[PDB]
């Protein structure tokens, strides 16, 4: 149903090694299209996917006089955050920016967000209403008050509801067989003996789109939750994903255990049992 | 607010000039612009902190602006070409992608080669027509500045000390006294107007100040007369009953 | 590039004046409207970030990304408005590029005209005699004259606050004592009721 374009920004200060490091990345759902590196050769916004490859050069030059100026605003930011936190000049500090928009089943604006965090801890984020700010620090308020002055919340609102979605649609159409695709997992189950007396069942899910999935073990119908290990969804390579769940089973009891896969890409939830 | 230093500058071709624009306190973004008579607002160099992110858009290598010694900014033009005679505007910004930019009064720049025509204006107040008071029932004054160069004048009417803003006119354009000629001299007109018996009451001090702009203690001169510096030529008149 | 027609536009007082501007890069987002007087300094007065209808009382800046244009509507146009209006687009990311700008003139309400030419006194400075055209109408034009070495300035509008009054102005003077005020405005067209006293 919903579709998201988000943007990701990174600025790590580096004392005695010149000007801070900058990394901007764009994402459509879970597909990457634009990336930037103030350390790489070309100094140009890079395409990755075919649907952005098609976009002409007036855009590229426009989004490299833009993202170099994005960097500049993030480079100055690092200094303000040292003044506010009362910190030492020689110190590797990380600032991060992420804005974005969503579009539902139909294709119109759903939700928006724009958020800053520094060193890892939360700083400031726009709420759901896009009318007020979340200031998650004792002295991140001093920034919040200023971000009402120039009606920053209101100006951003118009972007997220404006070109954010207008271009999101464009891209989605620029390559319909790249983004609007949905891939269902290729599921099976393996067996590992940890001893004569202990065993492991492992619910596989190979190459699927997008990320969102809910694997959970079942033991006699009941929600099995004790002897269960499960990893973070891992990116394969060819625009696909993988996730597995592990359960510890006593030597002999296998039939009792049935898997339960969830996804929007399969008719109804899939169940897996041991051979 | 903002202020650009100084007021003006008229210089000989080949001079260097630094231009000061004391910007609004607490502004981390500065833009340099130039525009004059015929031209529109033409961009030069935008700043951020103390780094020059965009330097492209300068007539020559003679052009270099720098802003590093704090917030205040400087623009350097070496060996002044005659082609750079323009009004240089400087505008600050609180954020970078903020709403308004704030322009200071700007600084007009004239690059002549001969200061051979630096003439102060001949300032003469013309007194109302006694016919106008019997007809319109209102008195009209005229301020004329015949023969001055260059196009650098700021006129203002003074009523018994204080500068009045009501009943005034000043044409933005003067006029060349001859058409297409070697270093012509200009003439600009101005009017005042007030109530009828106001003028006829001789207890009123109508003075017309003309802030001219000549040469500073940077260029000495002896060709015909003495040094024609930055001066003020004023024409005065009290009221007249009879 | 950002192109724009520069008129000049001439509008009567009260009427709506309209300024137009276009651009190239479709994906623009920042749109501003600065207003500069007689070589004073630009003062931002309208700005828009999204398509639609924003109003600062009289101003009414309208944007449309479809055709790639932005407008400005000034309802109840006052004579205190004549100045170069100035659209601006944010290029790259940060930097404002400008159009040539559009000169505006708001021809005032000369509600009770009285075309009359007066000479100004031989105020002991020079044998110059100043002839002055006053209270002519907004339909009038002021060319030069015969001897263009004898100077006539352009039209111009003034005020009288605590009176609530309005009129136009023009001047004509010579350095040669051979120039009257009847032959001064030989080019400037006069109505029928042009009060012409000669000293």
């Amino acid at each position: 149903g919903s579709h998201s374009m988000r943007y990701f920004f990174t600025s790590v200060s580096r004392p005695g090694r010149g000007e801070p490091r900058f990394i901007a990345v764009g994402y459509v759902d879970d597909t990457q299209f634009v990336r930037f590196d103030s350390d790489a050769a070309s100094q140009r916004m890079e395409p990755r996917a075919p649907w952005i490859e098609q976009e002409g050069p007036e855009y590229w030059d426009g989004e490299t006089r833009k993202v170099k100026a994005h960097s500049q605003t993030h480079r100055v930011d690092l200094g303000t955050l040292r003044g506010y936190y009362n910190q030492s000049e020689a110190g590797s500090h990380t600032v991060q920016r992420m804005y974005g928009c969503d579009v539902g089943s139909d294709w119109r604006f759903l939700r928006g967000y724009h958020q800053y965090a520094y060193d890892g801890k939360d700083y400031i984020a726009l709420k759901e209403d896009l009318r007020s700010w979340t200031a998650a620090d004792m002295a991140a308020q001093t920034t919040k008050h200023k971000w009402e002055a120039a009606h920053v919340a209101e100006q951003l609102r118009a972007y997220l509801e404006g070109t954010c979605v207008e271009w999101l649609r464009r891209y989605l159409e620029n390559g319909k067989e790249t983004l609007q695709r949905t891939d269902a997992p290729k599921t099976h189950m393996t067996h590992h003996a940890v001893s004569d007396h202990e065993a492991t069942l492992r619910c596989w899910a190979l190459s699927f789109y997008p990320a969102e999935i809910t694997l959970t073990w079942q033991r006699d119908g009941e929600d099995q939750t004790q002897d269960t290990e499960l990893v973070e969804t891992r990116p394969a390579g060819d625009g696909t994903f993988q996730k597995w769940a592990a359960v510890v089973v006593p030597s002999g009891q296998e039939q009792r255990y049935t898997c339960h896969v969830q996804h929007e890409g399969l008719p109804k939830p899939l169940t897996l049992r041991w051979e | 607010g903002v202020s650009q230093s100084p007021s003006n500058k008229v210089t000989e071709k080949g001079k260097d000039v630094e231009l000061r624009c004391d910007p609004i306190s607490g502004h981390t973004a500065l833009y340099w612009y130039r525009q004059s008579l015929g031209q529109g607002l033409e961009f030069l160099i935008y700043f951020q902190g103390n780094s020059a992110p965009d330097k492209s858009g300068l007539p020559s290598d003679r052009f270099s602006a720098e802003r590093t010694g704090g917030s205040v900014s400087t623009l350097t033009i070496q060996r002044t070409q005659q082609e750079d005679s323009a009004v240089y505007l400087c505008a600050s910004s609180l954020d970078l992608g903020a709403d308004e930019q704030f322009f200071g009064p700007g600084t007009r720049l004239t690059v002549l080669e001969d200061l051979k025509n630096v003439f102060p204006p001949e300032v003469a107040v013309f007194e109302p027509s006694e016919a106008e008071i019997s007809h319109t029932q209102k008195a009209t004054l005229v301020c004329l500045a015949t023969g001055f160069y260059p196009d650098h004048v700021e006129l203002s009417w003074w009523v018994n000390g204080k500068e009045v803003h009501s009943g005034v006119c000043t044409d933005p354009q003067p006029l060349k006294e001859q058409p297409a000629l070697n270093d012509s001299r200009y003439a600009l007109s101005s009017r005042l107007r007030v109530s009828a018996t106001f003028w006829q009451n001789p207890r009123n001090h109508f003075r017309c100040q003309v802030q001219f702009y000549g040469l500073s203690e940077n260029d000495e001169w002896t060709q015909d007369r003495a040094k024609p510096v930055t001066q003020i030529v004023s024409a005065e008149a009290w009221g007249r009953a009879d | 590039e950002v192109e724009q027609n520069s008129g000049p536009l001439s509008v009567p007082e009260g009427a709506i004046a309209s300024l137009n501007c276009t651009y190239s890069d479709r994906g623009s987002q920042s749109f501003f409207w600065y207003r500069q007087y007689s070589g004073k300094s630009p003062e931002l007065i309208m700005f828009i970030y999204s398509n639609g209808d924003k109003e600062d009382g009289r101003f009414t800046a309208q944007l449309n990304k479809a055709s790639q244009y932005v407008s400005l509507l000034i309802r109840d146009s006052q004579p205190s408005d004549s100045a170069t209006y100035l659209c601006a687009v944010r290029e790259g990311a940060q930097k404002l590029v400008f159009g040539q700008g559009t000169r505006l003139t708001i021809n005032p309400n000369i509600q009770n005209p009285d075309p009359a030419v007066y000479q100004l006194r031989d105020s002991k400075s020079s044998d110059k005699s100043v002839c002055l055209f006053t209270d002519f109408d907004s339909q009038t034009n002021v060319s030069q004259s015969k001897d263009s070495d004898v100077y006539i300035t352009d039209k111009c509008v003034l005020d009288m606050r605590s009176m609530d009054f309005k009129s136009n102005s023009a001047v004509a003077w010579s350095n040669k004592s051979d120039f009257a005020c009847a032959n001064a405005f030989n080019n400037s067209i006069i109505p029928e009721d042009t009060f012409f006293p000669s000293p």
């Binding site: 989004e63 100026a69 994005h70 605003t73 951003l156 954010c164 | 970078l96 | 944010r90």
Partner: peptide, 9 residues
């Protein structure tokens, strides 16, 4: 497409 108006804290 990126964001056009930028703010500093």
């Amino acid at each position: 497409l990126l964001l056009d108006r930028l703010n500093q804290l």
